[PDB]
Design a protein around this ligand. Structure first.
Ligand SMILES: C[C@H](CCC(=O)O)[C@H]1CC[C@H]2[C@@H]3[C@H](O)C[C@@H]4C[C@H](O)CC[C@]4(C)[C@H]3C[C@H](O)[C@]12C
Ligand SMILES: C[C@H](CCC(=O)O)[C@H]1CC[C@H]2[C@@H]3[C@H](O)C[C@@H]4C[C@H](O)CC[C@]4(C)[C@H]3C[C@H](O)[C@]12C
Lengths: 184, 184
């Protein structure tokens, strides 16, 4: 209720100003007292981690609905996932913009990354597994996520500005992403 | 003089606010009267095209200085070019941020793109030619430039935030770029 309202105004504020967004600004735009914000998130760090999970759950639920679990080929399954990402970001630009900033923030906790991997099993292995970014050492997975998000943002930009060619930008960006971030 | 001052304040303003940056804001920060700005650039469109050329000349002059023209291999020559881009953007973040916005703006004229290709011959063919983005139809070259810039920005971000691994981010981003934007 007030929580959904607070997460929504945090989304918009971080989309616009980054992890720096002020809590009072966020509380104001949710129409709650800043102290009430603190009852929901005592710290900027907690807010970042909860918002990330909230956004990531939203995204993954959208993927679950678009997904044809019969698909066996990893490239084709990866294309469908890319297409659902791109379309989620085009429908919800601030959600994409916020999650992009959260995903690279260094404030995400290992618990949070555990709750990320955990609570969508459907996505673990109705997709066999991986191929994407398997080739990178652990220390660079944040970087490989940053590259994926850079390519997806650019794809969305072009597709929003030139909708008559949206599908073409989507397929070219996918290929770029696939070539960049997978291996033999 | 006042022109260099005006281009410098346009760089900073577009870096911060996009092609939308106001001319009065720009004139103010250059410490000239807005009418004097109009003597240098009568239109926002002219300013965009002149600024782009100014930035692109700066970038290419930096590449000319780093370049070992003996290199024959296209991948190795392309790596050197990427490395000089990344380092130019890390040294001059607003220049990169402005040129990124200009490069995708749709206000760049064909004359301007002619003056782009023209006035750095050294770069045409002390590099044999191309490989990069040759596979795309003409209509998508702006998109392929957007992808290159997305990858380079991300690489710079990580390298500025984690300098002890700057070289590693640079080499991983390069490979991503090379795989995305070239073909067999
Ligand atoms: C679900 C899918 C794995 C499927 C596969 O390759 O078979 C994974 C691989 C890449 C992942 C994305 C990339 O890791 C980039 C982003 C990282 C952010 O932490 C979450 C959203 C984010 C956009 C990710 C969502 C999702 O977990 C993706 C899309
Ligand atoms: C000089 C080099 C061509 C060399 C080669 O592959 O052999 C080209 C190929 C890609 C070019 C870059 C990409 O086209 C992306 C950007 C496009 C902007 O219009 C200029 C800067 C920009 C960053 C370009 C500068 C320069 O002209 C590059 C780096």
């Amino acid at each position: 209720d007030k929580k959904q309202a607070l997460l929504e105004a945090a989304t918009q504020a971080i989309a616009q100003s980054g992890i720096a967004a002020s809590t009072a600004v966020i509380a104001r735009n949710a129409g709650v007292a800043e102290g009430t914000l603190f009852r929901y998130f005592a710290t900027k760090d907690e807010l970042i981690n909860t918002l990330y999970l909230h956004l990531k759950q939203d995204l993954c639920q959208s993927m679950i609905m678009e997904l044809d679990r019969s698909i066996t080929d990893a490239k084709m399954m990866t294309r469908f996932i890319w297409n659902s990402y791109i379309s989620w970001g085009l429908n919800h630009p601030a959600r994409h913009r916020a999650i992009r900033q959260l995903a690279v923030s260094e404030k995400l906790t290992k618990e949070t990354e555990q709750r990320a991997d955990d609570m969508f099993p459907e996505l673990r292995d109705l997709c066999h597994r991986s191929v994407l970014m398997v080739f990178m050492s652990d220390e660079y997975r944040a970087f490989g996520d940053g590259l994926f998000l850079a390519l997806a943002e650019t794809t969305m930009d072009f597709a929003a500005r030139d909708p008559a060619r949206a599908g073409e930008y989507i397929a070219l960006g996918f290929e770029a992403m696939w070539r960049a971030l997978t291996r033999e």
